[PDB]
Design a protein around this ligand. Structure first.
Ligand SMILES: [Ca+2]
Ligand SMILES: [Ca+2]
Lengths: 92, 92
């Protein structure tokens, strides 16, 4: 099959996953909370005193849950990459 | 559908692609050439005077073709990632 055809099926799988729904719900929940929205945004912005700002946000339970869901999404993408890149690892 | 189910279909798509076959053929061709194998290996090894070693290998046509095929494979993985991560970009 075509690599791009499958990639679009994989995008759909991600779009439809409970994991994406959970991340989206946390993201919306944080944005609906005026205090949390501001803290999360100032955190995001400071990443382009750091370290920081990370302490500010980690002390907030709901924002921490969102950040944890972000890191788990990053881990998932990492897993997908390890899966699909196996033939390259075999080669080298 | 399940994200992992599709990821394994995508691994199969990559395994079966002419692009993978081309990379593998170049890799094997370089390794079958005693002089080129040594240059490519010393290059790979120097990456963990650099810059370098990169000049050594780029002056060899066949090794350069392999390195170009590597970079195009990296670009392909990049494209797949951009595709599947679109729902995340929409969210943020
Ligand atoms: Ca917690
Ligand atoms: Ca050339």
């Amino acid at each position: 099959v075509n690599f791009y055809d499958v990639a679009y099926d994989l995008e759909n799988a991600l779009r439809g996953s409970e994991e994406f729904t959970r991340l989206k719900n946390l993201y919306d929940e944080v944005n609906a909370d005026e205090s949390a929205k501001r803290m999360f945004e100032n955190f995001r912005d400071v990443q382009l005193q750091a370290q920081k700002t990370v302490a500010l946000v980690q002390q907030h339970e709901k924002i921490s849950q969102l950040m944890e869901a972000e890191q788990r999404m990053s881990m998932l993408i990492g897993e997908l990459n390890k899966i699909i890149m196996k033939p390259l690892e075999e080669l080298y």
